[PDB]
Design a protein around this ligand. Structure first.
Ligand SMILES: [Zn+2]
Ligand SMILES: [Zn+2]
Lengths: 212, 213
C-alpha cells in the first residue's frame, strides 16, 4: 500500500530554513518522481519541484529563486525538502506527492508557519448568554502559533457547538471564538465550561461561562 | 507561468444533479491536464489525467474532456461523497500550475440566521482590548452581509469574519463577525450594533446593545 508520511508541523522565524521529510513505502521509491507542492490561501496550490530518486536528479520552480533543495535517500526511501530564507508568505501546508500521470499519492501535509511572533498562550474570555434558545461561547484570543483545541464540558457537550477557524490578527497573533446554542431554560441549572488547550505554550484553561 | 482559471468558483447542487466545471489554460497545454478532488483537512485526490482518463478506481460518473486550452470535468449524477472542492492542473510545461478550485456545496432550502451579539467581557476590558462578537447561527445560503454600526455610523476595516464548513446534519453555515477595538476607543461610544442582511430575512435584522448596560 503506497504511503507517504511527512514530518510534523514547523514554526520558524523569517530568515530561517525548514526541512520537511517524506517517508515513502509500498512502492519502488527509485522509479517514480516525488514532488513537493504547497497550499495556502491567496496563492492556492503551488508546485515547488521534483526529485527522481533513482539518480538524484531534481528540478525546481524557478520562482523560488534557488531557495528550495530536494534530496532523497534511496537506502531509507525518504525524500526531503529544505526551504531557506523563509518569509511570512511561505506560511502554508507543504505536501510531498508521487507522480505518474498526475499526482497519484500524497503525503498528509506539513504545516509550516513563518512569523516574527513569539509563542504565546491564549487569553480565554467568556461570551456570556444575555437576554427559547440562548447562545454562549468563549473568545480564545491572542495566541501563537496554531493550533488550539476547544471542547465544552470536557467533550460532554457537542450538539450546537461551532468552533470557528482562527484568524491571524495584525499583531501576528491568532484569535477565534467557540460558541454553542442551548435551551434558555437550562442556563439556571446546567454549567457550561469551555476547555482550551494550547500545547506550544503548555496552556490548559477551563472557563465557566455564566449568564449576566 | 500558465494560469489555470476555473469556472464557476463555487456551485450549489443536489444529489443526482449533473455538475459541470470548466478550466481555461492561459496557454495551450495539449491534453496534459489532471483533475483533483479535495476535502477539508485532506490532501487532493487524483480523479482524471491526460485530460480524459479516469484514474484507477474513480467512478464512471466522473468524466474529463478537452484539449488545448479548454477543459471540462463533468459529474453525471452527484453523490453525497462528491461535495468537495475540485481543482484542475496542467503538467505540460514548467512550472506545473493549478487552478484556484471550484467548491461544490449542498443545496437546501433557504434558512434565515438566528443573530446574537456579545459585548466585551469585563475580563477582556481589564486587559485593555475590546472585542464585540456577532454570531449568525445555521443559515443557508452562505451569502450574508454583516455590517457593524457604532453610534449609528457604519464601520469599515475593524472587523473580521469566520465561517464554518457546511453542517453535517442540516447543511447550514454559521458565522462570526468580530469587531476589535482598543479599550480606549471602545469606551468613547455607546451603541454597538450588528446588522444582518440575508435572503431568508424579509428585512435586515439588527442586534445591538448600549455599552455598560
Ligand atoms: Zn448552530
Ligand atoms: Zn461614537
Amino acid at each position: 500500500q503506497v504511503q507517504l508520511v511527512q514530518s510534523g508541523a514547523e514554526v520558524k522565524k523569517p530568515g530561517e530554513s525548514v526541512k520537511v521529510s517524506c517517508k515513502a513505502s509500498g512502492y519502488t521509491f527509485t522509479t517514480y518522481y516525488l514532488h513537493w507542492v504547497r497550499q495556502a490561501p491567496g496563492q492556492g496550490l503551488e508546485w515547488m519541484g521534483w526529485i527522481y530518486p533513482g539518480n538524484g536528479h531534481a528540478q525546481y520552480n524557478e520562482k523560488f529563486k534557488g531557495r528550495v533543495t530536494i534530496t532523497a535517500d534511496k537506502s531509507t526511501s525518504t525524500a526531503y525538502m529544505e526551504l531557506s530564507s523563509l518569509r511570512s508568505e511561505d506560511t502554508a501546508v507543504y505536501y510531498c506527492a508521487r507522480s505518474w500521470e498526475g499526482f497519484d499519492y500524497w503525503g498528509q501535509g506539513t504545516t509550516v508557519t513563518v512569523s516574527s511572533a513569539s509563542t504565546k498562550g491564549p487569553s480565554v474570555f467568556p461570551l456570556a448568554p444575555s437576554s427559547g434558545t440562548a447562545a454562549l461561547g468563549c473568545l480564545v484570543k491572542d495566541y501563537f502559533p496554531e493550533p488550539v483545541t476547544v471542547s465544552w464540558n470536557s467533550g460532554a457537550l457537542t450538539s450546537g457547538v461551532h468552533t470557528f477557524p482562527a484568524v491571524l490578527q495584525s499583531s501576528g497573533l491568532y484569535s477565534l471564538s467557540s460558541v454553542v446554542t442551548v435551551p434558555s431554560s437550562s442556563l439556571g441549572t446546567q454549567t457550561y465550561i469551555c476547555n482550551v488547550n494550547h500545547k506550544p505554550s503548555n496552556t490548559k484553561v477551563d472557563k465557566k461561562v455564566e449568564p449576566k | 507561468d500558465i494560469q489555470m482559471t476555473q469556472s464557476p468558483s463555487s456551485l450549489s447542487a443536489s444529489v443526482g444533479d449533473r455538475v459541470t466545471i470548466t478550466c481555461k489554460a492561459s496557454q495551450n497545454v495539449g491534453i496534459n491536464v489532471a483533475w483533483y478532488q479535495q476535502k477539508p483537512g485532506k490532501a487532493p485526490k487524483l480523479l482524471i489525467s491526460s485530460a480524459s482518463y479516469r484514474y484507477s478506481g474513480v467512478p464512471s460518473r466522473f468524466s474529463g474532456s478537452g484539449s488545448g486550452t479548454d477543459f471540462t470535468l463533468t459529474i453525471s449524477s452527484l453523490q453525497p461523497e462528491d461535495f468537495a472542492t475540485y481543482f484542475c492542473q496542467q503538467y505540460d510545461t514548467y512550472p506545473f500550475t493549478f487552478g484556484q478550485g471550484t467548491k461544490v456545496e449542498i443545496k437546501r432550502t433557504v434558512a434565515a440566521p438566528s443573530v446574537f451579539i456579545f459585548p466585551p467581557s469585563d475580563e477582556q476590558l481589564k486587559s485593555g482590548t475590546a472585542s464585540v462578537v456577532c454570531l449568525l447561527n445555521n443559515f443557508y445560503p452562505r451569502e450574508a452581509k454583516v455590517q457593524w454600526k457604532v453610534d449609528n455610523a457604519l464601520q469599515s476595516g475593524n472587523s473580521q469574519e469566520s465561517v464554518t464548513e457546511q453542517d453535517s446534519k442540516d447543511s447550514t453555515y454559521s458565522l462570526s463577525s468580530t469587531l476589535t477595538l482598543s479599550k480606549a476607543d471602545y469606551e468613547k461610544h455607546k451603541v454597538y450594533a450588528c446588522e444582518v442582511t440575508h435572503q431568508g430575512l424579509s428585512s435586515p435584522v439588527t442586534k445591538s446593545f448600549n455599552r455598560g448596560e
